[PDB]
Design a protein around this ligand. Structure first.
Ligand SMILES: Nc1ncnc2c1ncn2[C@@H]1O[C@H](COP(=O)(O)OC(=O)c2cnc(Cl)s2)[C@@H](O)[C@H]1O
Ligand SMILES: Nc1ncnc2c1ncn2[C@@H]1O[C@H](COP(=O)(O)OC(=O)c2cnc(Cl)s2)[C@@H](O)[C@H]1O
Lengths: 518, 518
């Protein structure tokens, strides 16, 4: 892959590479569609519009939007102007977005109407710098200083040229949560999604122009941002977007061509979603779908899930591992080389190192801390020098995963190095769940650990000590949590115990809980 | 009043004042009591303990504690060591405390056991610098590294001298919220509580050594901090503290001598609480109580509440207005000079100005913006230069209130200049409540305004536009907000309307809602 030139604007790059296919559908969703030419026009008009409201090069805007045709316009339009979009999870709380507004110093927000209430709450509680709110598909009357996204785009002529950005200039942020502390602002350059889209989207997945890409992982996920934006635009594929929650029924409807007159040829999702789909009694037969490639990320793919999918569809699930920090997969199975129970082989262009506690090599078959050297690494966590130095050093990026290298060069996930859980491809801190449970007045202590279901898919499991003189229901706690945290941050099962296992120091013996002693 | 010396440590000042009365009870609560000697001992041992864990002079510690004998130990012990306690409301959310931890850079937390769960959540989610959590009266097992307050204090010899602070050095912070944005860190000096305790506590209220002080307003409120700590310690009075919520029954029990063998002689609280007590069927008779002085603040005292109290008890309610920024009252009725319907006269030592639209004087009988010039003003809002400039300008502190000066020199409250409400005498932002309501899926729009109830007390009133195509009941809306807002923020009434009055920009015409137009 040829490196991007020193002067490089990733949005310009994606627009330019599709000037040969102006009338092909770039993006289609439930209610709208954009050809590549329409996408380019709206992108450059939004770029002009953002500059007109005074957002300057390198300033941030918050992109808080459901998947839909407006999303790539917002993302690329900002980048084309040299403005840094901060693309965020749409399922978070007002508290979460309040922090993101403050930390990013976002000068404007591009928000879906359905998310306007939580954004409004975040704006009211925060010390933000937001000058304008741009509402895509408003679901309530606009407030002062808010503008409809279509009107905002429609009111400005296209910017003539992209900002004169450098390949190594920041292009966009994603936020990544760790086990404690605030979410980290992961800074990606213009070059980074070029490298992922070439090394992985084109050269590993072999995406091509006639594909129809459809990702259950939303665009704000590093995974989905490649799957359903940077990858397909790099090759001219058509992308199906879906705003609603990706349930088996919702995915099946898209697979069967229920939207846009298109049948996806390439699907991406999390192992949990594949398992839920394989269990569904209305699972389509392979004769009904156009799938040629099934991609997985976000959590390890149990061999039994992939084997069952392959038996039913005659397609493998191609499991790869990426991270927010590396932007896309650095270890992956190949479309025609799948070893279930492993994450496959280094993606060409990425170097992988496993390190033991001494920082030295580890023997094959022994677990080591996974480090990645690749051209798509984020530059830093914005405003967190300490965590940046711990994660990014000397061209190597520390994943916080443990991995085993097998005899055939494949890599098998061996767990985390920080108790983070990955439920449905989204990071979940067990400590955040625990601290919310203990706020319930009937809870004395609580411990949340990751426990595999029969499938080998890790889910949060709560061990709760009730307070004497109170009785607790499991649903009572789930509700209590949903009233405070994002809606997916709840234990999948809860066991009430008289006492938690602890060391002499009072430290909870989480391994005993995981291992099932109680 | 003689100014404090330039070398001045307020905690040492209060300890020194009471060395003449070592065996008198300083503080007593449901389960404990501290003589002035015991208080000084425990204060100086806590000061040494904080220094021993590395907290340095001028660093902050978060003081998140229910009222109880440990509270003045934590507060004065920090101050004695030259460490800045940040005394905060105990009814806030984990997100509020997470912000306060980061914003204050608190190096330790002193927390009541009952509040450890919300603190734990705040620690887990924030980028804090807390080195140690000290738990007063733990309600659940200590976590590794945490220490019990009693052990923490008991494990360290008393510091031999206080930090050699100056009178105008920061001594402590309180947090105060405005209609939007984060709570503001109000910075008070060592001199400020000297000025309030001398000018108001001693010279206006005439508190004296044989008083027993009891404040419904908690110690973290500027009002309560004077009422139940700086004022009584200044004169050697005994103070009754109560951890639980101040219901009429809870207050009556202590008025009647149910705790510590003492009957309060001085009571302080909000007009809302006085109204609640006057409505209580077991309102004590004046022969049953030892009250000689009843103070109110927080919201305007409706004349009928004062008059009914005076008719029942033969005792007036002495209404004074203070603020977090001014620390205590700057306009007040006097123990023997009460004009109901007014906040009385300037507190000697404080200069009052009413300013019009251009900053000039306003003619008597006309409302103006209230500005205060007095020696207890906070110096700034920490880390917010913009809001500091708008509030503190050249010796004058802008209250955010409007007032009318009467012919007899008294001052009659004329509302706020900023949409904030004082419900139950506590700051409530209508915008917070609105932003909570619109996150309910059946709510399209919401407007919250203050309306005076049957007793003349302002309560929030919600006007809600339901979302078309959704079912929404007043009961389900009450359930929705019950576990999302503190009770004092609950709208006392919700009206479902078809539309809200707006300007063309979408601004809600809240004045029309206050005028009953809907
Ligand atoms: N395939 C696979 N196996 C095992 N663990 C995996 C995995 N994919 C992802 N993880 C875990 O998730 C962490 C990275 O999370 P992000 O939420 O930081 O990155 C996303 O998962 C992405 C997945 N694909 C992309 Cl392309 S980006 C990782 O460290 C693993 O712990
Ligand atoms: N007595 C009285 N009448 C009318 N309004 C009053 C009032 N006291 C207080 N207010 C309002 O409350 C604002 C200040 O609120 P605060 O939480 O910063 O401080 C407290 O209310 C204090 C009250 N007494 C103390 Cl001593 S500290 C004020 O601006 C008024 O709007």
């Amino acid at each position: 892959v040829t490196p991007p030139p020193e002067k490089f604007n990733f949005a310009e790059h994606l627009l330019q590479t599709n000037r040969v296919r102006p009338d092909k559908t770039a993006f289609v969703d439930d209610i709208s569609s954009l050809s590549f030419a329409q996408l380019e026009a709206q992108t450059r008009q939004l770029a002009a519009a953002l500059r007109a409201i005074g957002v300057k090069r390198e300033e941030r805007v918050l992109l808080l939007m459901l998947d839909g045709t407006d999303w790539p316009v917002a993302f690329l339009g900002a980048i084309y102007a040299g403005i840094v979009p901060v693309a965020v999870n749409t399922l978070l709380t007002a508290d979460d977005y309040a922090y993101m507004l403050e930390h990013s110093r976002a000068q404007a927000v591009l928000v879906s109407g359905a998310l306007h209430p939580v954004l409004k709450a975040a704006l009211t509680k925060s010390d933000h710098e937001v000058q304008r709110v741009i509402v895509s598909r408003p679901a309530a009357p606009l407030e002062p200083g808010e503008v409809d996204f279509a009107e905002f785009v429609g009111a400005h002529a296209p910017l003539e040229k992209p900002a004169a950005t450098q390949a190594d200039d920041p292009a966009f942020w994603l936020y990544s949560s760790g086990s404690t502390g605030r979410p980290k602002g992961v800074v990606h350059t213009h070059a980074n999604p070029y490298w992922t889209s070439e090394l992985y989207g084109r050269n590993t997945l072999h995406l091509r122009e006639d594909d129809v890409c459809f990702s259950a992982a939303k665009l704000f996920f590093a995974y989905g941002l490649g799957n359903a934006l940077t990858f397909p635009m790099t090759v001219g594929a058509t992308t199906l977007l879906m705003g609603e929650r990706p349930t088996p029924d919702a995915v099946f409807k898209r697979w069967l061509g229920g939207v846009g007159g298109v049948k996806p040829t390439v699907f991406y999702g999390a192992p949990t979603g594949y398992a839920g789909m394989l269990a569904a009694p209305n699972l389509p037969s392979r004769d009904q779908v156009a799938l040629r490639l099934a991609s997985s990320a976000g959590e390890a793919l149990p061999a039994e899930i992939g084997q069952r999918f392959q038996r039913h569809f005659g397609l493998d699930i191609v499991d790869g591992i990426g991270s927010t920090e590396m932007l896309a997969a650095f270890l992956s199975n190949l479309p025609d080389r799948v070893r279930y129970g492993t994450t496959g082989w280094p993606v060409p262009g990425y170097q992988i190192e496993l390190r033991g506690d001494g920082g030295g090599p580890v023997a094959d078959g022994e677990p080591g801390d996974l480090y990645i050297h690749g051209p798509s690494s984020a530059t830093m966590y914005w405003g967190n020098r300490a965590k940046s130095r711990d994660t990014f050093q000397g061209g190597w990026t520390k994943s916080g995963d443990k991995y085993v290298r097998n005899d055939d060069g494949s890599y098998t996930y061996a767990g985390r190095t920080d108790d983070m859980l990955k439920v449905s491809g989204i990071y979940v801190s067990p400590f955040e769940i625990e601290a919310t449970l203990v706020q319930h007045p009937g809870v004395l202590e609580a411990a949340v650990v990751g426990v595999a279901d029969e499938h080998g898919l890790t889910k949060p499991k709560a061990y709760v000590v009730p307070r004497p003189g109170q009785t607790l229901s499991e649903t009572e706690l789930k509700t209590f949590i949903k009233d405070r945290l994002a809606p997916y941050k709840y234990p999948r099962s809860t066991v009430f115990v008289a006492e938690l296992p602890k060391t002499a120091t009072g430290k909870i013996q989480r391994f005993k809980l995981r291992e099932g002693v109680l």
